[PDB]
Amino acid sequence: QTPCYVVDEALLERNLVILKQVIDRTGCKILLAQKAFSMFACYPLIGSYLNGTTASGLFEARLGKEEMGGETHIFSPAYREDEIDEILSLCDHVIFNSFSQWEKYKAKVLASGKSAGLRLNPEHSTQDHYDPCSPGSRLGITLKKFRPDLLDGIEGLHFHTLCEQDAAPLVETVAVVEEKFGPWLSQMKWLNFGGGHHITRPGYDIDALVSCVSRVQERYGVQVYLEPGEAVALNAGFLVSTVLDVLENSGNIAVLDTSAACHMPDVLEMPYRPPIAGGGGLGEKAYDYRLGGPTCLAGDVIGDYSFDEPLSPGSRVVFCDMAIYSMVKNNTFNGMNLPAIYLKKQDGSIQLVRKFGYEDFKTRLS
Amino acid sequence: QTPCYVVDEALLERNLVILKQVIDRTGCKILLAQKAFSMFACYPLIGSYLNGTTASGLFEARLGKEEMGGETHIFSPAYREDEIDEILSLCDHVIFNSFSQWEKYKAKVLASGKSAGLRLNPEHSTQDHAIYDPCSPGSRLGITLKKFRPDLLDGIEGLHFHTLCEQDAAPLVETVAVVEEKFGPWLSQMKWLNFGGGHHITRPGYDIDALVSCVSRVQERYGVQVYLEPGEAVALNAGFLVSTVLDVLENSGNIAVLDTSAACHMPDVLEMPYRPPIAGGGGLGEKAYDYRLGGPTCLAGDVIGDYSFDEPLSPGSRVVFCDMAIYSMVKNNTFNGMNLPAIYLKKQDGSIQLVRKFGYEDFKTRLS
Amino acid sequence: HHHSSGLV
Amino acid sequence: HHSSGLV
Ligand SMILES: [K+]
Ligand SMILES: [K+]
């Protein structure tokens, strides 16, 4: 039933095997950053390789705790007073964004017995200066604002500064963390290097990551955590769509039953061009098509692709790398029904996980 | 309870009064285009001024029919075979995007007795940004003249176009003239024409008289019922998003972390992008304190904007974003697991009613 | 686009 | 994100 997401356990496992290699070679721990991928039908499988989850807030923390188990970590730029009590029940590690936040909740944290951390902003930009180390970032504590006199009760330090990056910028950022915050690392029980590590992308320098993690754990006597999101589900899911109509207007136009605006919003927002199985670039194959959504939106154009044979009503189009940053942020704009969610099991069978309908659209509006 | 949307009936009514003026002065009909605003707690009020709704698909058609009543129109670039029967049971006017679509469903339409139309692409661009313009080359929306099939119009009772966005009357008048030049020989036989949305009818300064004159002339010349289907105009400047400041910090300037997220709760702010109005907020350097306002998400880029205020923002300060009824609740999300803002209705008598409050289950049920 | 005319 | 998709 199209449109539908399909997540493939064998492809998830290919990624998880690499992450488990890093765990086994270093003694570090690795958590799923749920903001990238929260498909909890897969949490038990993921939890059989990884150590738990991290969360952006109460809802992700509850989902990780209840559907995966293991360790449940959380970070937020600012916690809500009306949620901190439940957060401290669910989570075993809780990361604060500022000294004001830490001091506000310190008494409750100590009474809960859970492990408190602080997020650091090392001000070492390795992206495009969306970069958490860009000037004016609200994420993490800069050295100039760091309060060593207020570290009683802090057991960990955390940073997250990367996105789809290799080991070298991590190694470089760790060196800056040591230069700036070095005197306060020894007293911690754990350090968390964040996400953005493209660990499962072919060619990633696993050896450099292993060496860096091991050196830090040894030098400071800490447990290191990594919290990748994208790497867990990279190239492990698809979005399957059926062509509904084909028309001619200064070229071939295909109306699909999936919408970029509703079902893969980053395609339009970023923007980026998703891979299509059997699809090429314009002029690469025999037929060029502009693929558009079934919405009333002039701008809901998925992209221009070529195919060796015609697309016609009933043709199936398979978008790739559709597990990450997709289902976690899709919407019902224009009243489009949400795509169904399927799981392709490692034995090859396919299970319907979730099918949506009118009530899912209606209940958001009043 | 913040963050929360608040829609104000008095401000909705200010807009609806203008739309009703147009109906009363012309005898046209006006529908709510639900894609902009689908807050069905307000549909009875809206339906007391307007003639019904139009829809982008089955779900909007069902919502309009069940929650407003009146007339229920629909247009889609391509209908699903598994939905056409229910669509025909709900809708009284059904607009097809192509002759292939019309011919595919013609037999069912005739059996249903509902009124069929076609969307035209007059290929007359008047919008600034071509990416959003349904008349831009290669558009998938509507039938261009070179593709028009006069021999296949048996059973067609209406013609439709939608080509504007936040525009005054003059671009509509100009587009109507193009429609007459290109499709004129086929207008007389229609029962209705639909001029679409994008008419900024409720924006102060809109040339209502020019709209009235154009609608009246077309209705008279061709003996048709004209429909307008604004979305934004119905709810323009009729809602707010109220947020509380959670933390304030300093990093090359003052930063406030709010309990609302642009990425989750007003995504057009980041995507367009655009700067939403804040009550009491000015531009950078205009008032005493400059702040960068950011969301409570783990997203470096979830920055609402830079604003100035006469007094400091502190934890507990309330910030009120304006013009938040349109293209907001209809497309928001639970990225990062942020809870959806509550929805309130400020009634004509000044009382405030909680319409809908969300929680964990609304986030979880979307994921498996 | 769709947010040109907001007012306090 | 979305920089490394493959068929
Ligand atoms: K230690
Ligand atoms: K007529």
Helix (H, G, I), strand (E, B) or coil at B279: coil
Q: Do B322 and C1 touch (CB under 8 A)?
A: no
Does the distance separating the beta carbons of C5 and B237 come in below 8 Å? yes
- Of B31, B9, B21, B75, the C-alpha closest to B229 is B31
Q: Do A321 and D3 touch (CB under 8 A)?
A: no
CA distance B342 to B349: 21
Task: Kindly state the tokens that stand for A191.
Answer: 């350090």
Rg of chain A on CA atoms, in Å: 22
Q: Are A96 and A106 in contact (CB under 8 A)?
A: no
Nearest to A164 by CA among B284, B308, D4: D4
User: Which CATH code of 3.40.50.2300, 3.60.70.12, 3.30.930.10, 3.20.20.10 fits the domain covering A9-233?
Assistant: 3.20.20.10
**Partner A contacted by B145 (CB < 8 A):** no
Are D6 and A276 a contacting pair at CB < 8 A?
no
Task: Give the closest ligand to the alpha carbon of residue A188.
Answer: 1
Q: List residues in chain C touching B: CB distance below 8 A.
A: 1-8
Contacts of A245 in chain B (CB under 8 A): 77-78, 97-98, 100-101
- B253: its two tokens: 């300037």
B60 has a chain A CB within 8 A of its CB: yes
- How many other β-carbons are positioned within 10 Å of the β-carbon of residue B154? 7
Element (H, E) at B320: strand B318-322
Which residue has 């993921």 as its token pair?
A46
Please list, residue by residue across B281-313, b when 16 or more beta carbons sit within 10 angstroms of its beta carbon and e when fewer do. beeeeeeeebbbbbbbbbbbebbbbbbbbeeeb
CB–CB of A33/A196 below 8 Å?
no
Closest among B363, B342, B242, B248 to B294, alpha carbons compared: B248
**How crowded is residue A215: how many other Cβ atoms within 10 Å of its Cβ?**
14
* Contacts of residue A75, Cβ cutoff 8 Å, sequence gap at least 6: A54, A55, A56, A95, A97, A117, A119, A158, A160, B298
Task: Determine, for residues B356 and A335 on separate chains, whether the beta-carbon distance falls below 8 Å.
Answer: no
What is the identity of the amino acid at B215? V
Q: Which of B111, B104, B112, B186 is nearest to B149 (CA)?
A: B186
Closest ligand to the CA of A220: 1
Query: What is the Cα Rg of chain C in Å?
Result: 6
Chain B partners of A301 at a C-beta cutoff of 8 Å?
A: 131, 140
Fold adopted by B9-235: TIM Barrel (3.20.20)
Is position A266 annotated in a ligand binding site? yes
CA distance B276 to B328: 12
Q: Is B210 on the interface with A (CB under 8 A)?
A: no
Tokens of A280: 């090429």
From residue A244, alpha-carbon distances to B59, B77, B80 in Å are 18, 9, 7
**Chain C residue numbers touching B203 (CB-CB < 8 A):** 5
Do chains C and D meet with 3 or more Cβ pairs nearer than 8 Å? no
Q: Which chains touch B (3 or more CB pairs under 8 A)?
A: A, C
Q: How far is the CA of A214 from the centre of ligand 1 (A)?
A: 14
Give me the phi and psi of A360, to 5 degrees please: -65, -35
User: Phi first, then psi: what are they for B94, rounded to 5°?
Assistant: -130, 120
Which chains share 3+ C-beta pairs under 8 angstroms with A? B, D
Of A39, A121, A248, the CB nearest to B367: A39
Of C1, C7, C8, the CB nearest to B272: C1
Beta bridge partners of A74: A94
3-state secondary structure of B52: strand
Between CA B98 and CA A334, with CA A257 as vertex, the angle to 5 degrees is: 85
D contact set with A (CB within 8 A): 1-7
Name the structure determination technique. X-ray
Instruction: Write the secondary structure of chain A as one string of H (helix), E (strand) and C (coil).
Output: CCCEEEEEHHHHHHHHHHHHHHHHHHCCEEEEECCCCCCHHHHHHHHCCCCEEECCCHHHHHHHHHHCCCEEEEECCCCCCCCHHHHHHHCCEEEECCHHHHHHHHHHHHHHCCEEEEEECCCCCCCCCCCCCCCCCCCCECHHHCCHHHCCCEEEEECCCCCCECHHHHHHHHHHHHHHHHHHCCCCCEEECCCCECCCCCCCCHHHHHHHHHHHHHHHCCEEEECCCHHHHCCCEEEEEEEEEEEECCCEEEEECCCHHHHCCHHHHCCCCCCECCCECCCCCCEEEEEECCCCCCCCEEEEEEECCCCCCCCEEEEECCCCCCHHHCCCHHHCCCCEEEEECCCCCEEEEECCCHHHHHCCCC
Distance, in angstroms, between D1 CA and closest chain A CA?
A: 6
Name the CATH code of domain B239-324+332-364 (choices 1.10.357.10, 2.40.110.10, 2.40.37.10, 3.40.630.10). 2.40.37.10
Q: Are B170 and B199 in contact (CB under 8 A)?
A: no
Contacts of A350 (CB under 8 A, 6+ apart): A6, A342, A343, A344
CB contact under 8 A, B166 and C4: yes
What does DSSP say about strands A154-158 and A115-119: parallel, antiparallel, or unpaired?
parallel
Please name the residue that has the structure tokens 């070492």. Answer: A124
Say which amino acid occupies B210. A
Provide the CA B367 distance to its chain's centre, in angstroms: 27
Ligand-binding site membership of A92 (annotated): no
CB contact under 8 A, A78 and B257: yes
Q: Does B73 touch chain A (CB under 8 A)?
A: no
Nearest to A103 by CA among C6, B249, B163: B249
Domain boundaries, chain B: 9-235, 239-324+332-364
- B173 — phi, psi (to 5°)? -55, -45
Ligand in nearest proximity to the CA of A157: 1
Measured over the CA atoms of residue B276, residue B278, residue B279 and residue B280, the dihedral's sign is negative
Can you say whether residue A205 is alpha, beta or left, with left for phi > 0 and alpha for psi between -120 and 50 degrees? Answer: beta
Which run of H or E residues covers position B33? strand B29-33
From the CA of B223, the nearest ligand is: 2
Query: Could you tell me if B301 lies within 8 Å of chain A, comparing CB atoms?
Result: yes
What single-letter amino acid sits at B234?
A: V
Angle at B331 between CA B87 and CA B206, to 5 degrees: 90
Question: How far off is chain C from B204, nearest CA to CA, in Å?
Answer: 10
Of B68, B65, B151, the C-alpha closest to B114 is B65
* Nearest residue in chain B measured CA to CA from A270: B271
The secondary structure of residue B366, as a DSSP letter, is T
CATH H superfamily, domain A237-322+330-362: Lyase, Ornithine Decarboxylase; Chain A, domain 1 (2.40.37.10)
Task: Say if residue A203 is exposed, middle or buried (CB neighbours under 10 Å; 0-12, 13-18, 19+).
Answer: exposed
Q: How far apart are CA A329 and CA A241, in angstroms?
A: 19
The alpha carbon of residue D5 is apart from the nearest alpha carbon of chain A, in Å, by 5
Which residues, other chains included, contact B273 with Cβ-Cβ below 8 Å and sequence gap of 6+? none
Interface test with C, best of B133, B164, B236, B310 (most C CBs within 10 A): B236
Cα distances from B34 to residues A210, A298, A327, A333, B73, in angstroms, run: 54, 16, 24, 10, 11
CA distance B325 to B37: 7
Kindly give the distance from the C-alpha atom of residue B224 to the centroid of ligand 2, in angstroms, as a whole number.
Answer: 5
**CB-CB contact of A57 with A230 (8 Å):** no
The H or E element that residue B71 is part of is: strand B71-75
CA A208 to mean position of chain CA atoms: 23
- Rounded distance from Cα B335 to ligand 1 centre (Å): 35
Q: How many CB pairs under 8 A join A and D?
A: 37
d(CA C3, nearest CA chain B) in Å: 7
What is the spatial distance between Cα B15 and Cα B203, in angstroms, rounded to a whole number? 9
d(CA A145, CA A139): 12
Do B9-235 and B239-324+332-364 show the same overall fold?
no
Tell me how close the Cα of B334 comes to any Cα of chain A, in angstroms. 6
B34-48 CB burial, b ≥16 within 10 A, e <16: bbbbbbbbbbebbbe
How many angstroms is the resolution? 1.4
Structure token digits, residue A48: 């059989």
Closest ligand to B188 CA? 2
Residue A15 is which amino acid? N
